[PDB]
């Protein structure tokens with residue numbers, strides 16, 4: 366099964382994962398409705414997910430994508446937030462489980478974008494205990510994943526795709542809202558992502574203005 370490797374805070378790998386998570390916080394158009402109000406996270410722990418079958422399935426797909434993309438995986442480290450997090454670390458990503466780019470598995474460069482989905486779409490009803498989307502008490506988890514993009518198809522309008530377009534492996538969707546769009550990285554096969562880092566954290570309440 367799955368083994369969780371515990372990274373130490375003094376490790377460079379722990380520090381780079383934290384830095385990527387802290388530096389990619391941005392303001393969201395919903396004004397903090399989904400993920401809460403914060404400028405920084407309190408990182409509780411960073412764990413490396415080790416699972417032989419998930420790694421085998423990921424290697425196998427990686428090789429296929431490489432062959433169709435002039436021997437390039439086109440791998441990127443991206444954030445993912447989901448109420449399925451526990452099933453992801455044990456069984457892997459599952460495309461069988463509304464998005465602006467069709468029935469895919471969505472990844473963001475912004476950690477704050479993935480934080481909006483910890484409790485489900487639009488932040489759901491928030492944490493189970495306080496029903497608070499901006500809870501500063503309850504521990505949250507998000508993933509920092511290896512994502513095999515291969516040949517990405519560039520999408521600029523909302524389209525309901527079932528699979529990557531012919532000859533392609535992923536979709537880079539930019540959904541325009543009043544002319545502004547942040548990229549969403551979409552895969553349509555769970556084996557095209559590995560849940561490399563499990564980050565346990567809290568959002569932090571900014572000091573009163």
Ligand SMILES: Oc1nc(-c2ccc(C(F)(F)F)cc2)nc2c1CSCC2
Nearest residue numbers: 445446447471472473479482485486549
């Ligand atoms: O990290 C993300 N997660 C999800 C996401 C995960 C699980 C679920 C569901 F609750 F299971 F239906 C819904 C959406 N969507 C997005 C991103 C980052 S890019 C923007 C879209």
Ligand SMILES: [Zn+2]
Nearest residue numbers: 492495500503
């Ligand atoms: Zn709570």
